[PDB]
Amino acid sequence: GSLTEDGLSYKEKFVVRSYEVGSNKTATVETIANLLQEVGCNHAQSVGFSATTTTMRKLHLIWVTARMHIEIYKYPAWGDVVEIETWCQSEGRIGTRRDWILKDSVTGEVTGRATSKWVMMNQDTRRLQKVSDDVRDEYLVFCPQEPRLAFPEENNRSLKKIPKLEDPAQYSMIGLKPRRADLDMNQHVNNVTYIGWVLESIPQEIVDTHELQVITLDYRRECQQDDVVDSLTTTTSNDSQFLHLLRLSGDGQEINRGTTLWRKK
Amino acid sequence: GSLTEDGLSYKEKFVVRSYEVGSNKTATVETIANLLQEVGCNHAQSVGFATTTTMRKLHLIWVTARMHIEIYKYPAWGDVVEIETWCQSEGRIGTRRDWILKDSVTGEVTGRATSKWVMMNQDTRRLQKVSDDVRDEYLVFCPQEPRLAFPEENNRSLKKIPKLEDPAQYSMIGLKPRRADLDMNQHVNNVTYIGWVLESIPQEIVDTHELQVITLDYRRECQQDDVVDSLTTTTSDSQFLHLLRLSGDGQEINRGTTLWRKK
Numbered sequence A: 001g002s003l004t005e006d007g008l009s010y011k012e013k014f015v016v017r018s019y020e021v022g023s024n025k026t027a028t029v030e031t032i033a034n035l036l037q038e039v040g041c042n043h044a045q046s047v048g049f050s051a052t053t054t055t056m057r058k059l060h061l062i063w064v065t066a067r068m069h070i071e072i073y074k075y076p077a078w079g080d081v082v083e084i085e086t087w088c089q090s091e092g093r094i095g096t097r098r099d100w101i102l103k104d105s106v107t108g109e110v111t112g113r114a115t116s117k118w119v120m121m122n123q124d125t126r127r128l129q130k131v132s133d134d135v136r137d138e139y140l141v142f143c144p145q146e147p148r149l150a151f152p153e154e155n156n157r158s159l160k161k162i163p164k165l166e167d168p169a170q171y172s173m174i175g176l177k178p179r180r181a182d183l184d185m186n187q188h189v190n191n192v193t194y195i196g197w198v199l200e201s202i203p204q205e206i207v208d209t210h211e212l213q214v215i216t217l218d219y220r221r222e223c224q225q226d227d228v229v230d231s232l233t234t235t236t237s238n239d240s241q242f243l244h245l246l247r248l249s250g251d252g253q254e255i256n257r258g259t260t261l262w263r264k265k
Numbered sequence B: 001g002s003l004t005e006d007g008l009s010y011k012e013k014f015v016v017r018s019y020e021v022g023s024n025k026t027a028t029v030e031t032i033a034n035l036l037q038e039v040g041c042n043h044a045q046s047v048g049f050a051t052t053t054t055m056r057k058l059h060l061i062w063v064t065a066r067m068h069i070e071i072y073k074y075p076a077w078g079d080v081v082e083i084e085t086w087c088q089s090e091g092r093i094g095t096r097r098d099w100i101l102k103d104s105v106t107g108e109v110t111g112r113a114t115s116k117w118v119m120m121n122q123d124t125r126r127l128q129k130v131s132d133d134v135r136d137e138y139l140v141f142c143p144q145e146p147r148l149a150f151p152e153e154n155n156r157s158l159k160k161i162p163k164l165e166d167p168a169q170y171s172m173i174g175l176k177p178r179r180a181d182l183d184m185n186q187h188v189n190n191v192t193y194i195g196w197v198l199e200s201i202p203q204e205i206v207d208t209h210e211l212q213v214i215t216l217d218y219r220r221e222c223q224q225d226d227v228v229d230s231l232t233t234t235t236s237d238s239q240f241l242h243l244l245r246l247s248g249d250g251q252e253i254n255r256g257t258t259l260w261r262k263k
């Protein structure tokens, strides 16, 4: 991987692995979401981060994901090479945005795109806060100054408000627990696990006859290593649409809400 | 990746990814076991395949009976690890696949693995000796002289594993596979079982020790809708005896041993 000529974005190529593919012999949406993490971390490292700034580390401040929106046109096949380009952008005091473009290395065509929204949180108190100018000026030199949007469209799916699923749900997967392989290097549940957990309540018949096209996921609360999760889904719709809810098996505390769009194979 | 000059083994380099590392900022044993799958599949593909044309005609598949992994140094995030793999016949019982893991910068051996495979009818799940027609098809891709990742006489890779007695010292109950645990044929990926065995090791062992050796026997497959119990008892360096069984009737699916060194 490497930063582009202007040093305002980062590119990296990935060969799709044998264990990274599903039943259709193409990369899963969780494999893709992991590749977005890998290109994201390599972009931060190539510009001095390790992505907390000097001031964030001093104040015990971290960047946390509020929303992830992924849209896939063609999932890459096992053995194919996918090139991913990523960049960040400031959104005032609310936080930052990280976008991605996925391409076929052989054809140069766009096979997918993603956008994520990040907010600042105190690592210990878990309290959110608006970005301070001292922190803001530290990373503004690594972002483009003109708007560069993976989803520019006048009316796009990445900014839609997601409602809360009403009980009873149509489908459900109960008693989901994270294992050590679901944890990151800081012993927190990896954000991609939640994507997998949302998809767990989609019936196998939809999974076998449709391909996931769009997924929007809001992150409200973290699932701890010793928590149990319930995954709920209700059909809201040639296209299938679903409303999703992740909550703690006990009290029913919400951790995530989302929507998926699937098209017939 | 590529086959070596003699076309009797396969090499491939891997850069360790951010999501592939644990709390020590080094690759997990499950990440390593997945890299062994990837280099294994690329070796088969580069030589025409691990089912032969005769196996497909008879509905025969290769299944893992045993996996033995020994790690001296887990690679760090960003490091490049080079893996060399090769297969070898073991008569009529089956085949063996071995691996050597190295540091790309130093050339030193950082780990090694050996796995034992048997032939099974994919439909009846019945084991069988390898026929000569099948055997001759793949013998041209294996070295003719013995080439062993674990040559040492009376080594840990060939030891018999006993069955854990109830009550177990530690346990993790109600383990279920999710879609990300399945392979391209909707079967549970063999690496998931490794993760499930380690689930019953206490977090205090995990935080103070590093896994050095893991030997895992595969007896029965966990179906997508099965629930698993992971049992562990200390037998000792820390040594543990492991057992994976179905949450209901208690049917055995796996047994193993792990060896851990103080950090």
Ligand SMILES: O=C(O)c1sccc1-n1cccc1
Binding pocket: A033, A034, A036, A037, A040, A041, A065, A068, A116, A190, A191, A192
């Ligand atoms: O989880 C993270 O910290 C990172 S880093 C860049 C992408 C993501 N992400 C968030 C949701 C799914 C993937």
Ligand SMILES: O=C(O)c1sccc1-n1cccc1
Binding pocket: B033, B034, B036, B037, B040, B041, B064, B067, B115, B189, B190, B191
């Ligand atoms: O599972 C498989 O089919 C393959 S392919 C080569 C290595 C393995 N394996 C088996 C146990 C752990 C890894």
